[PDB]
Unconditional design. Structure first.
Ligand code: A1L0R
Ligand code: CL
Length: 138
């Protein structure tokens, strides 16, 4: 087991063809999960499953610049379930992050922060037991 919140360093930043894989289990009665790809204090890509936002399950994605959140991108496809094991894969492509959950494409998030090699850490937080967090080049 890994302790949450967990920081995964991304040495030399992200780059196209880098694949990040996160394995864990959603806690029973979970409320939220978050992945935060950080450029210093900025959050280049925040991926935030919300299990009960006005009795709806939604994934909210955004960017934080100078401590301000931007325009939300929302996805109603919601592949996570309380109590159950998941796999998140984030593939860096030239123009977006591509996210798959449990081997099924979920969403893409266009790069707003364009200095990819300065996005040097991934934070993993929220209502999970974390099994593994790693990266490889494809
Ligand atoms: C309903 N709601 N949600 C938000 C913010 O909406 C953002 C996305 O647009 C982020 O999700 C942010 N957030 C979430 C977490 C967070 C932490 C700990 C774990 Br553990 C974990 F899983 C996590 F998601 N930290 N910051 C969240 O607080 N805000 C919000 C709140 C403030 Cl004070 C200012 C601006 C906003 C808004 F502009 F974005 F809307 C509202 S109101
Ligand atoms: Cl939240």
């Amino acid at each position: 087991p890994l302790i949450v919140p967990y920081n995964l360093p991304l040495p030399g930043g992200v780059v196209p063809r880098m694949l990040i894989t996160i394995l864990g289990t959603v806690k029973p009665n979970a409320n939220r999960i978050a992945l935060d790809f950080q450029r210093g204090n900025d959050v280049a890509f925040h991926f935030n499953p919300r299990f009960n936002e006005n009795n709806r399950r939604v994934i909210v994605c955004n960017t934080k610049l100078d401590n301000n959140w931007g325009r939300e991108e929302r996805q109603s496809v919601f592949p996570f379930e309380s109590g159950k094991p998941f796999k998140i894969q984030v593939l860096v492509e030239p123009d977006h992050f591509k996210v798959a959950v449990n081997d099924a494409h979920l969403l893409q998030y266009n790069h707003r922060v364009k200095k990819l090699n300065e996005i040097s850490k991934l934070g993993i937080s929220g209502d999970i037991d974390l099994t593994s967090a790693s990266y490889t080049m494809i």
